[PDB]
mmCIF file of N, CA, C and O and ligand atoms in Angstrom:
data_model
loop_
_atom_site.group_PDB
_atom_site.id
_atom_site.type_symbol
_atom_site.label_atom_id
_atom_site.label_comp_id
_atom_site.label_asym_id
_atom_site.label_seq_id
_atom_site.Cartn_x
_atom_site.Cartn_y
_atom_site.Cartn_z
ATOM 1 N N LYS A 1 18.371 -14.996 8.922
ATOM 2 C CA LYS A 1 17.560 -14.351 9.993
ATOM 3 C C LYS A 1 17.674 -12.831 9.966
ATOM 4 O O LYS A 1 18.583 -12.275 9.345
ATOM 5 N N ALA A 2 16.740 -12.166 10.641
ATOM 6 C CA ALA A 2 16.717 -10.709 10.683
ATOM 7 C C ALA A 2 15.717 -10.182 11.702
ATOM 8 O O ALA A 2 14.868 -10.920 12.213
ATOM 9 N N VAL A 3 15.826 -8.895 12.001
ATOM 10 C CA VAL A 3 14.912 -8.265 12.932
ATOM 11 C C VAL A 3 13.679 -7.878 12.136
ATOM 12 O O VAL A 3 13.792 -7.366 11.019
ATOM 13 N N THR A 4 12.505 -8.142 12.691
ATOM 14 C CA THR A 4 11.277 -7.784 12.004
ATOM 15 C C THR A 4 10.497 -6.817 12.871
ATOM 16 O O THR A 4 10.200 -7.116 14.030
ATOM 17 N N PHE A 5 10.191 -5.650 12.314
ATOM 18 C CA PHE A 5 9.424 -4.643 13.031
ATOM 19 C C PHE A 5 7.971 -4.756 12.589
ATOM 20 O O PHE A 5 7.689 -4.992 11.411
ATOM 21 N N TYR A 6 7.053 -4.603 13.539
ATOM 22 C CA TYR A 6 5.631 -4.695 13.236
ATOM 23 C C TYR A 6 4.883 -3.431 13.610
ATOM 24 O O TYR A 6 5.218 -2.741 14.580
ATOM 25 N N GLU A 7 3.851 -3.153 12.830
ATOM 26 C CA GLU A 7 3.010 -1.989 13.019
ATOM 27 C C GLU A 7 2.113 -2.073 14.253
ATOM 28 O O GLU A 7 1.953 -1.089 14.960
ATOM 29 N N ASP A 8 1.533 -3.237 14.521
ATOM 30 C CA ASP A 8 0.637 -3.370 15.670
ATOM 31 C C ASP A 8 1.143 -4.276 16.782
ATOM 32 O O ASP A 8 2.097 -5.040 16.613
ATOM 33 N N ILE A 9 0.482 -4.180 17.931
ATOM 34 C CA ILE A 9 0.855 -4.984 19.081
ATOM 35 C C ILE A 9 0.778 -6.462 18.733
ATOM 36 O O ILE A 9 -0.003 -6.872 17.869
ATOM 37 N N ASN A 10 1.617 -7.247 19.396
ATOM 38 C CA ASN A 10 1.670 -8.690 19.209
ATOM 39 C C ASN A 10 1.940 -9.106 17.761
ATOM 40 O O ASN A 10 1.315 -10.030 17.236
ATOM 41 N N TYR A 11 2.876 -8.408 17.123
ATOM 42 C CA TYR A 11 3.283 -8.704 15.752
ATOM 43 C C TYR A 11 2.168 -8.620 14.717
ATOM 44 O O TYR A 11 2.129 -9.412 13.783
ATOM 45 N N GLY A 12 1.272 -7.654 14.872
ATOM 46 C CA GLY A 12 0.187 -7.510 13.916
ATOM 47 C C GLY A 12 0.419 -6.376 12.934
ATOM 48 O O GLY A 12 1.325 -5.558 13.120
ATOM 49 N N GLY A 13 -0.399 -6.334 11.884
ATOM 50 C CA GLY A 13 -0.287 -5.285 10.882
ATOM 51 C C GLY A 13 0.883 -5.438 9.925
ATOM 52 O O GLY A 13 1.423 -6.534 9.751
ATOM 53 N N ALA A 14 1.272 -4.331 9.297
ATOM 54 C CA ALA A 14 2.388 -4.341 8.357
ATOM 55 C C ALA A 14 3.698 -4.625 9.081
ATOM 56 O O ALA A 14 3.864 -4.272 10.251
ATOM 57 N N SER A 15 4.625 -5.274 8.385
ATOM 58 C CA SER A 15 5.915 -5.604 8.969
ATOM 59 C C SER A 15 7.046 -5.335 7.991
ATOM 60 O O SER A 15 6.839 -5.314 6.777
ATOM 61 N N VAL A 16 8.242 -5.132 8.534
ATOM 62 C CA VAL A 16 9.435 -4.882 7.732
ATOM 63 C C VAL A 16 10.652 -5.476 8.431
ATOM 64 O O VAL A 16 10.889 -5.220 9.612
ATOM 65 N N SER A 17 11.423 -6.271 7.700
ATOM 66 C CA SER A 17 12.605 -6.891 8.269
ATOM 67 C C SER A 17 13.887 -6.163 7.875
ATOM 68 O O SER A 17 14.022 -5.682 6.751
ATOM 69 N N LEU A 18 14.826 -6.086 8.810
ATOM 70 C CA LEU A 18 16.096 -5.424 8.558
ATOM 71 C C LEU A 18 17.289 -6.211 9.082
ATOM 72 O O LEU A 18 17.209 -6.902 10.106
ATOM 73 N N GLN A 19 18.398 -6.094 8.363
ATOM 74 C CA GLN A 19 19.640 -6.754 8.733
ATOM 75 C C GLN A 19 20.375 -5.814 9.682
ATOM 76 O O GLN A 19 19.964 -4.668 9.866
ATOM 77 N N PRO A 20 21.462 -6.288 10.307
ATOM 78 C CA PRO A 20 22.229 -5.448 11.232
ATOM 79 C C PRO A 20 22.648 -4.135 10.562
ATOM 80 O O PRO A 20 22.941 -4.109 9.361
ATOM 81 N N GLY A 21 22.663 -3.049 11.334
ATOM 82 C CA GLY A 21 23.042 -1.755 10.794
ATOM 83 C C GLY A 21 22.552 -0.599 11.648
ATOM 84 O O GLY A 21 21.903 -0.807 12.681
ATOM 85 N N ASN A 22 22.869 0.625 11.227
ATOM 86 C CA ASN A 22 22.445 1.826 11.949
ATOM 87 C C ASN A 22 21.573 2.628 10.990
ATOM 88 O O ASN A 22 22.071 3.293 10.082
ATOM 89 N N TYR A 23 20.266 2.565 11.201
ATOM 90 C CA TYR A 23 19.332 3.227 10.307
ATOM 91 C C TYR A 23 18.727 4.530 10.816
ATOM 92 O O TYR A 23 18.173 4.579 11.913
ATOM 93 N N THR A 24 18.827 5.572 9.996
ATOM 94 C CA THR A 24 18.274 6.889 10.315
ATOM 95 C C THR A 24 16.816 6.898 9.878
ATOM 96 O O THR A 24 16.347 5.960 9.225
ATOM 97 N N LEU A 25 16.117 7.978 10.203
ATOM 98 C CA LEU A 25 14.710 8.124 9.854
ATOM 99 C C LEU A 25 14.518 7.976 8.350
ATOM 100 O O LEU A 25 13.626 7.260 7.895
ATOM 101 N N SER A 26 15.357 8.668 7.584
ATOM 102 C CA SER A 26 15.280 8.616 6.131
ATOM 103 C C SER A 26 15.409 7.189 5.609
ATOM 104 O O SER A 26 14.657 6.768 4.731
ATOM 105 N N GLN A 27 16.365 6.449 6.153
ATOM 106 C CA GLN A 27 16.601 5.078 5.729
ATOM 107 C C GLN A 27 15.457 4.136 6.137
ATOM 108 O O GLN A 27 15.126 3.202 5.406
ATOM 109 N N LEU A 28 14.844 4.390 7.290
ATOM 110 C CA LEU A 28 13.724 3.575 7.733
ATOM 111 C C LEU A 28 12.575 3.815 6.750
ATOM 112 O O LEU A 28 11.917 2.871 6.306
ATOM 113 N N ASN A 29 12.341 5.080 6.414
ATOM 114 C CA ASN A 29 11.277 5.427 5.481
ATOM 115 C C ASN A 29 11.487 4.730 4.139
ATOM 116 O O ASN A 29 10.541 4.193 3.561
ATOM 117 N N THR A 30 12.726 4.749 3.648
ATOM 118 C CA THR A 30 13.053 4.113 2.374
ATOM 119 C C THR A 30 12.734 2.621 2.446
ATOM 120 O O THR A 30 12.277 2.031 1.466
ATOM 121 N N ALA A 31 12.969 2.023 3.613
ATOM 122 C CA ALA A 31 12.696 0.607 3.821
ATOM 123 C C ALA A 31 11.211 0.375 4.096
ATOM 124 O O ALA A 31 10.805 -0.718 4.494
ATOM 125 N N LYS A 32 10.411 1.416 3.898
ATOM 126 C CA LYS A 32 8.963 1.344 4.090
ATOM 127 C C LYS A 32 8.499 1.328 5.550
ATOM 128 O O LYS A 32 7.418 0.827 5.860
ATOM 129 N N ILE A 33 9.317 1.877 6.442
ATOM 130 C CA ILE A 33 8.956 1.964 7.851
ATOM 131 C C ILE A 33 8.667 3.430 8.163
ATOM 132 O O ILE A 33 9.568 4.266 8.134
ATOM 133 N N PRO A 34 7.397 3.763 8.444
ATOM 134 C CA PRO A 34 6.992 5.134 8.760
ATOM 135 C C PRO A 34 7.516 5.567 10.127
ATOM 136 O O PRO A 34 7.936 4.735 10.941
ATOM 137 N N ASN A 35 7.483 6.868 10.382
ATOM 138 C CA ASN A 35 7.937 7.376 11.665
ATOM 139 C C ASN A 35 6.815 7.167 12.682
ATOM 140 O O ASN A 35 5.642 7.131 12.310
ATOM 141 N N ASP A 36 7.178 7.018 13.955
ATOM 142 C CA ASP A 36 6.192 6.805 15.020
ATOM 143 C C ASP A 36 5.161 5.811 14.502
ATOM 144 O O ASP A 36 4.039 6.184 14.156
ATOM 145 N N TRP A 37 5.553 4.541 14.467
ATOM 146 C CA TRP A 37 4.711 3.486 13.921
ATOM 147 C C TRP A 37 5.009 2.106 14.514
ATOM 148 O O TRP A 37 4.121 1.273 14.619
ATOM 149 N N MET A 38 6.259 1.864 14.896
ATOM 150 C CA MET A 38 6.655 0.566 15.437
ATOM 151 C C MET A 38 6.085 0.270 16.833
ATOM 152 O O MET A 38 6.286 1.032 17.777
ATOM 153 N N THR A 39 5.376 -0.851 16.947
ATOM 154 C CA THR A 39 4.762 -1.271 18.206
ATOM 155 C C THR A 39 5.323 -2.573 18.769
ATOM 156 O O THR A 39 5.300 -2.779 19.982
ATOM 157 N N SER A 40 5.807 -3.457 17.897
ATOM 158 C CA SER A 40 6.386 -4.721 18.344
ATOM 159 C C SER A 40 7.434 -5.221 17.357
ATOM 160 O O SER A 40 7.459 -4.799 16.205
ATOM 161 N N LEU A 41 8.301 -6.119 17.806
ATOM 162 C CA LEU A 41 9.358 -6.634 16.943
ATOM 163 C C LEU A 41 9.907 -7.970 17.405
ATOM 164 O O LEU A 41 9.883 -8.287 18.596
ATOM 165 N N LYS A 42 10.424 -8.739 16.451
ATOM 166 C CA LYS A 42 11.024 -10.033 16.736
ATOM 167 C C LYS A 42 12.533 -9.874 16.588
ATOM 168 O O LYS A 42 13.008 -9.274 15.620
ATOM 169 N N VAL A 43 13.282 -10.408 17.551
ATOM 170 C CA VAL A 43 14.736 -10.295 17.550
ATOM 171 C C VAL A 43 15.444 -11.645 17.683
ATOM 172 O O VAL A 43 15.199 -12.392 18.631
ATOM 173 N N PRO A 44 16.341 -11.969 16.735
ATOM 174 C CA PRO A 44 17.070 -13.240 16.784
ATOM 175 C C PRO A 44 17.863 -13.325 18.086
ATOM 176 O O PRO A 44 18.358 -12.308 18.578
ATOM 177 N N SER A 45 17.982 -14.526 18.649
ATOM 178 C CA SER A 45 18.727 -14.693 19.892
ATOM 179 C C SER A 45 20.182 -14.305 19.669
ATOM 180 O O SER A 45 20.807 -14.734 18.702
ATOM 181 N N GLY A 46 20.715 -13.484 20.566
ATOM 182 C CA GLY A 46 22.096 -13.057 20.436
ATOM 183 C C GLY A 46 22.230 -11.678 19.817
ATOM 184 O O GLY A 46 23.307 -11.092 19.840
ATOM 185 N N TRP A 47 21.139 -11.165 19.260
ATOM 186 C CA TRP A 47 21.133 -9.845 18.631
ATOM 187 C C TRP A 47 20.664 -8.784 19.623
ATOM 188 O O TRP A 47 20.033 -9.101 20.626
ATOM 189 N N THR A 48 20.973 -7.522 19.337
ATOM 190 C CA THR A 48 20.557 -6.418 20.197
ATOM 191 C C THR A 48 19.924 -5.328 19.334
ATOM 192 O O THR A 48 20.439 -4.996 18.266
ATOM 193 N N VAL A 49 18.806 -4.777 19.794
ATOM 194 C CA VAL A 49 18.128 -3.727 19.047
ATOM 195 C C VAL A 49 17.951 -2.469 19.881
ATOM 196 O O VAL A 49 17.243 -2.476 20.891
ATOM 197 N N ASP A 50 18.604 -1.389 19.463
ATOM 198 C CA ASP A 50 18.486 -0.122 20.166
ATOM 199 C C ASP A 50 17.582 0.827 19.388
ATOM 200 O O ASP A 50 17.954 1.331 18.320
ATOM 201 N N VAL A 51 16.385 1.054 19.928
ATOM 202 C CA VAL A 51 15.397 1.928 19.307
ATOM 203 C C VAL A 51 15.525 3.309 19.925
ATOM 204 O O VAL A 51 15.478 3.458 21.150
ATOM 205 N N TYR A 52 15.703 4.316 19.077
ATOM 206 C CA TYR A 52 15.848 5.683 19.550
ATOM 207 C C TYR A 52 14.612 6.520 19.252
ATOM 208 O O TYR A 52 14.008 6.406 18.184
ATOM 209 N N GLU A 53 14.250 7.365 20.211
ATOM 210 C CA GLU A 53 13.087 8.232 20.086
ATOM 211 C C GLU A 53 13.281 9.319 19.036
ATOM 212 O O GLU A 53 12.327 9.733 18.397
ATOM 213 N N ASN A 54 14.509 9.784 18.852
ATOM 214 C CA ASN A 54 14.762 10.824 17.856
ATOM 215 C C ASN A 54 15.659 10.336 16.728
ATOM 216 O O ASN A 54 16.149 9.207 16.757
ATOM 217 N N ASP A 55 15.867 11.188 15.729
ATOM 218 C CA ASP A 55 16.699 10.811 14.589
ATOM 219 C C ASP A 55 18.176 10.782 14.958
ATOM 220 O O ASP A 55 18.601 11.361 15.968
ATOM 221 N N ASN A 56 18.952 10.094 14.131
ATOM 222 C CA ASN A 56 20.385 9.981 14.320
ATOM 223 C C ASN A 56 20.797 9.417 15.679
ATOM 224 O O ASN A 56 21.743 9.883 16.307
ATOM 225 N N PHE A 57 20.062 8.408 16.122
ATOM 226 C CA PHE A 57 20.361 7.717 17.364
ATOM 227 C C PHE A 57 20.542 8.619 18.585
ATOM 228 O O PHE A 57 21.556 8.554 19.286
ATOM 229 N N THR A 58 19.545 9.464 18.829
ATOM 230 C CA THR A 58 19.560 10.352 19.984
ATOM 231 C C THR A 58 18.190 10.275 20.649
ATOM 232 O O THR A 58 17.288 9.589 20.159
ATOM 233 N N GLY A 59 18.032 10.987 21.754
ATOM 234 C CA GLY A 59 16.779 10.941 22.474
ATOM 235 C C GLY A 59 16.764 9.674 23.307
ATOM 236 O O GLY A 59 17.776 8.969 23.403
ATOM 237 N N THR A 60 15.619 9.370 23.904
ATOM 238 C CA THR A 60 15.495 8.177 24.732
ATOM 239 C C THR A 60 15.787 6.903 23.944
ATOM 240 O O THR A 60 15.329 6.740 22.811
ATOM 241 N N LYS A 61 16.548 5.999 24.549
ATOM 242 C CA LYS A 61 16.908 4.745 23.894
ATOM 243 C C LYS A 61 16.343 3.501 24.586
ATOM 244 O O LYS A 61 16.648 3.241 25.747
ATOM 245 N N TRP A 62 15.527 2.736 23.863
ATOM 246 C CA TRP A 62 14.938 1.508 24.392
ATOM 247 C C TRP A 62 15.662 0.329 23.755
ATOM 248 O O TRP A 62 15.817 0.273 22.532
ATOM 249 N N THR A 63 16.087 -0.617 24.586
ATOM 250 C CA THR A 63 16.832 -1.778 24.113
ATOM 251 C C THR A 63 16.047 -3.088 24.167
ATOM 252 O O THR A 63 15.353 -3.360 25.143
ATOM 253 N N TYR A 64 16.165 -3.897 23.114
ATOM 254 C CA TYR A 64 15.471 -5.182 23.049
ATOM 255 C C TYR A 64 16.385 -6.298 22.567
ATOM 256 O O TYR A 64 17.091 -6.141 21.568
ATOM 257 N N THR A 65 16.355 -7.430 23.270
ATOM 258 C CA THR A 65 17.189 -8.576 22.924
ATOM 259 C C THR A 65 16.404 -9.869 22.696
ATOM 260 O O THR A 65 16.988 -10.951 22.600
ATOM 261 N N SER A 66 15.084 -9.759 22.608
ATOM 262 C CA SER A 66 14.243 -10.927 22.374
ATOM 263 C C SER A 66 12.904 -10.466 21.816
ATOM 264 O O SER A 66 12.578 -9.282 21.896
ATOM 265 N N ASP A 67 12.131 -11.388 21.245
ATOM 266 C CA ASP A 67 10.840 -11.021 20.679
ATOM 267 C C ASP A 67 10.056 -10.165 21.662
ATOM 268 O O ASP A 67 10.005 -10.455 22.856
ATOM 269 N N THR A 68 9.446 -9.104 21.147
ATOM 270 C CA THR A 68 8.696 -8.175 21.975
ATOM 271 C C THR A 68 7.325 -7.873 21.379
ATOM 272 O O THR A 68 7.214 -7.146 20.392
ATOM 273 N N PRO A 69 6.257 -8.435 21.974
ATOM 274 C CA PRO A 69 4.891 -8.213 21.489
ATOM 275 C C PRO A 69 4.394 -6.799 21.769
ATOM 276 O O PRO A 69 3.396 -6.357 21.203
ATOM 277 N N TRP A 70 5.104 -6.090 22.638
ATOM 278 C CA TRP A 70 4.748 -4.725 23.003
ATOM 279 C C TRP A 70 5.989 -4.014 23.537
ATOM 280 O O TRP A 70 6.509 -4.364 24.594
ATOM 281 N N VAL A 71 6.454 -3.011 22.799
ATOM 282 C CA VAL A 71 7.655 -2.268 23.172
ATOM 283 C C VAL A 71 7.512 -1.429 24.442
ATOM 284 O O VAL A 71 8.507 -0.988 25.013
ATOM 285 N N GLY A 72 6.281 -1.218 24.889
ATOM 286 C CA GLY A 72 6.067 -0.428 26.088
ATOM 287 C C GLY A 72 5.324 0.862 25.782
ATOM 288 O O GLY A 72 5.382 1.373 24.663
ATOM 289 N N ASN A 73 4.631 1.395 26.778
ATOM 290 C CA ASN A 73 3.864 2.618 26.588
ATOM 291 C C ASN A 73 4.692 3.812 26.117
ATOM 292 O O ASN A 73 4.285 4.529 25.197
ATOM 293 N N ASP A 74 5.845 4.031 26.744
ATOM 294 C CA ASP A 74 6.699 5.150 26.372
ATOM 295 C C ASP A 74 7.317 4.971 24.992
ATOM 296 O O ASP A 74 7.392 5.918 24.220
ATOM 297 N N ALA A 75 7.752 3.753 24.693
ATOM 298 C CA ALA A 75 8.394 3.453 23.422
ATOM 299 C C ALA A 75 7.450 3.225 22.244
ATOM 300 O O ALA A 75 7.890 3.241 21.098
ATOM 301 N N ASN A 76 6.162 3.025 22.504
ATOM 302 C CA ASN A 76 5.233 2.765 21.409
ATOM 303 C C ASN A 76 5.114 3.902 20.394
ATOM 304 O O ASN A 76 4.979 5.066 20.759
ATOM 305 N N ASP A 77 5.160 3.549 19.115
ATOM 306 C CA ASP A 77 5.055 4.539 18.044
ATOM 307 C C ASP A 77 6.032 5.694 18.200
ATOM 308 O O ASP A 77 5.665 6.844 17.971
ATOM 309 N N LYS A 78 7.263 5.409 18.608
ATOM 310 C CA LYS A 78 8.240 6.485 18.749
ATOM 311 C C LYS A 78 9.551 6.258 18.005
ATOM 312 O O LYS A 78 10.346 7.185 17.877
ATOM 313 N N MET A 79 9.784 5.044 17.514
ATOM 314 C CA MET A 79 11.032 4.766 16.804
ATOM 315 C C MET A 79 11.245 5.728 15.641
ATOM 316 O O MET A 79 10.414 5.810 14.731
ATOM 317 N N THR A 80 12.359 6.454 15.692
ATOM 318 C CA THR A 80 12.726 7.415 14.660
ATOM 319 C C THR A 80 14.066 7.028 14.027
ATOM 320 O O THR A 80 14.356 7.405 12.890
ATOM 321 N N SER A 81 14.882 6.287 14.773
ATOM 322 C CA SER A 81 16.170 5.778 14.287
ATOM 323 C C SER A 81 16.441 4.511 15.088
ATOM 324 O O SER A 81 15.877 4.331 16.172
ATOM 325 N N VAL A 82 17.293 3.628 14.574
ATOM 326 C CA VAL A 82 17.542 2.370 15.266
ATOM 327 C C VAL A 82 18.855 1.682 14.892
ATOM 328 O O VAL A 82 19.264 1.666 13.723
ATOM 329 N N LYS A 83 19.519 1.120 15.897
ATOM 330 C CA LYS A 83 20.755 0.392 15.674
ATOM 331 C C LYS A 83 20.509 -1.093 15.931
ATOM 332 O O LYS A 83 19.913 -1.468 16.948
ATOM 333 N N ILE A 84 20.966 -1.929 15.000
ATOM 334 C CA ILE A 84 20.794 -3.377 15.087
ATOM 335 C C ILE A 84 22.149 -4.079 15.077
ATOM 336 O O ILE A 84 22.964 -3.853 14.180
ATOM 337 N N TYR A 85 22.384 -4.938 16.064
ATOM 338 C CA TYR A 85 23.641 -5.667 16.142
ATOM 339 C C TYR A 85 23.427 -7.173 16.161
ATOM 340 O O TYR A 85 22.457 -7.670 16.734
ATOM 341 N N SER A 86 24.341 -7.898 15.528
ATOM 342 C CA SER A 86 24.265 -9.348 15.509
ATOM 343 C C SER A 86 24.997 -9.834 16.760
ATOM 344 O O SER A 86 25.268 -11.022 16.919
ATOM 345 N N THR A 87 25.305 -8.889 17.644
ATOM 346 C CA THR A 87 25.996 -9.183 18.897
ATOM 347 C C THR A 87 25.214 -8.578 20.067
ATOM 348 O O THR A 87 25.826 -7.857 20.883
HETATM 349 CA CA1 LIG B 101 1.710 1.270 15.818
HETATM 350 CA CA1 LIG B 102 9.754 9.961 17.784
#
């Protein structure tokens, strides 16, 4: 299992899956995830996803613990860095 980030609302468009870890903007890009692009994501039960508005896990932080068809108006297309936990 893994966290899957999607380009469009309700899990539409391009997608990219990631294992637990702390990913910076550069690392997201390498994994084929553009900046200000994430709109929805699926999260395994028991996992936690901290999406940060700025690089290096700073700026506003939005947390998700279950499938999310829409991250929210403020959080939409703002993920620049992200921490993923299997806890
Ligand atoms: Ca988008
Ligand atoms: Ca941003």
